[PDB]
Amino acid sequence: LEQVLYFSKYIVLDPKGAILNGVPVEKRQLLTDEEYRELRYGKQETYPLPPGVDALVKDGE
Amino acid sequence: KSDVYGRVEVDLVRNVVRVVESYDIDARMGAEAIQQLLKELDLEALEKELLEEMKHPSRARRAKARKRLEVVRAFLDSGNRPEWMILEAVPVLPPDLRATSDLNDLYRRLINRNNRLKKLLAQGAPEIIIRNEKRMLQEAVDALLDNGRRGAPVTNPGSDRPLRSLTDILSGK
Amino acid sequence: KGEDVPEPSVPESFRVLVKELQALALDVQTLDEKDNPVDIF
């Protein structure tokens, strides 16, 4: 873990990570910047659709 | 009522108030990361919990704790708190104390990126570049402390010779 | 000069090592007989 954060960018938790990810806050653990940016400051990935093609789900199903 | 932590998007289209699980907290990295974590943890607290984690559990988990409380007791009684652990001020040995004695070489490498850092800081703040710089940073600082612990710093091609660092001039036959 | 030989107060090796350690963390503090500061140089 040391070299994992010290030199790299792997960030360690500090306050309260109220939100989950399958398990509550990690208290003082750490994760990847992806998930960090993803879950922490929020995530919202888009999904374009092919030209002239219907889907298989409602508006916000 | 809300059931999670995040922002709210008042969508009247579907006539519904959705909330994206997006809250905000803190979290640092690199040296500074632990820096805060150090100053925080109350020695007296962990020591207590440890002593509990000691004579209570089996010899399996109590083993690690025993080794743990050691270093704990150290900073405690000694007084010198674990905050100094990080180096935010790297002293410089006097000139006449240093084949072209190496030492100087490494020192320059430090100031080099150290200053470049300060520059790349006041100006833009490109993350990817900032971290990539800290890397070169942490690496250099350690080069002088104990060269080798990670790779083997050497003068540009041709001079593949681990510039003798502080520790190097203290130990060895 | 016909005078008694000098009595080295501190070998260059002494003071050099003190700071040599200072150069890296090592807060080498020279205390006296009763836990008190002691001027090195």
Side-chain angles (χ1 to χ4, degrees):
Chain A
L1 280 39
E2 244 51 70
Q3 153 171 171
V4 192
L5 84 90
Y6 247 2
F7 290 51
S8 181
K9 196 189 171 301
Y10 293 67
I11 299 172
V12 299
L13 207 169
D14 228 85
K16 32 64 261 305
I19 302 309
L20 356 70
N21 64 292
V23 69
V25 61
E26 248 60 5
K27 294 164 182 181
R28 284 189 294 168
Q29 203 77 183
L30 97 178
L31 49 57
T32 162
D33 225 39
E34 252 217 292
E35 278 79 310
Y36 169 37
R37 162 195 52 236
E38 179 180 309
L39 286 296
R40 223 309 132 250
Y41 276 31
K43 195 219 180 183
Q44 215 310 345
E45 188 173 295
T46 177
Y47 281 86
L49 306 196
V53 185
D54 59 63
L56 303 178
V57 186
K58 269 283 280 183
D59 168 11
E61 184 213 301
Chain B
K1 317 173 299 176
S2 161
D3 312 320
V4 201
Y5 309 73
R7 192 207 324 147
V8 62
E9 232 66 304
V10 188
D11 264 2
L12 321 174
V13 185
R14 295 142 279 253
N15 300 299
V16 51
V17 173
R18 51 185 168 76
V19 184
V20 55
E21 176 170 57
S22 311
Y23 229 42
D24 50 76
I25 73 160
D26 271 8
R28 307 158 183 60
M29 58 279 198
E32 146 162 53
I34 325 312
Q35 138 119 49
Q36 277 281 178
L37 306 162
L38 282 172
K39 314 184 133 187
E40 298 219 349
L41 273 184
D42 226 308
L43 350 179
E44 30 273 60
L46 294 68
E47 194 203 1
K48 292 177 156 86
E49 307 171 61
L50 269 169
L51 296 167
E52 307 278 316
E53 178 69 8
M54 304 272 265
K55 286 170 159 290
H56 296 185
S58 314
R59 182 168 284 85
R61 35 176 177 158
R62 88 183 224 180
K64 190 161 198 169
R66 90 92 183 179
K67 157 191 185 184
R68 190 156 196 178
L69 179 54
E70 300 188 56
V71 199
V72 184
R73 204 89 203 181
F75 293 76
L76 274 167
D77 296 3
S78 297
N80 327 77
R81 324 208 73 180
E83 287 60 89
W84 330 134
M85 287 297 261
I86 57 89
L87 323 178
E88 57 180 64
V90 176
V92 184
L93 192 78
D96 305 283
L97 272 90
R98 53 181 183 300
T100 301
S101 52
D102 301 6
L103 355 305
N104 307 307
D105 299 349
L106 274 182
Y107 264 124
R108 307 210 283 153
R109 309 202 131 290
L110 178 75
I111 344 296
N112 264 175
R113 293 172 182 165
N114 162 58
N115 289 65
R116 199 220 311 186
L117 193 69
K118 315 179 62 179
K119 306 180 171 181
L120 309 169
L121 274 170
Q123 297 179 176
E127 242 300 317
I128 291 179
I129 303 174
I130 270 295
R131 225 308 171 214
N132 240 62
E133 193 58 14
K134 304 306 174 295
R135 281 153 40 70
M136 318 256 117
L137 171 58
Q138 190 83 284
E139 293 173 57
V141 188
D142 305 314
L144 73 85
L145 244 185
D146 196 319
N147 199 72
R149 277 283 164 75
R150 198 137 169 183
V154 298
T155 282
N156 298 54
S159 174
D160 292 313
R161 148 201 67 194
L163 326 167
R164 159 155 291 183
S165 58
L166 262 166
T167 312
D168 300 326
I169 202 74
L170 298 171
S171 194
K173 283 114 189 177
Chain C
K1 186 167 70 290
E3 187 171 56
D4 255 8
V5 316
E7 41 296 276
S9 37
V10 158
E12 279 303 76
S13 293
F14 177 30
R15 59 172 77 283
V16 68
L17 264 175
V18 178
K19 287 298 170 290
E20 194 172 309
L21 268 65
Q22 300 277 285
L24 57 169
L26 280 306
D27 181 59
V28 186
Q29 185 64 114
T30 44
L31 288 76
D32 195 43
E33 339 292 63
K34 292 132 292 79
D35 334 291
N36 359 62
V38 182
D39 202 59
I40 322 165
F41 317 71

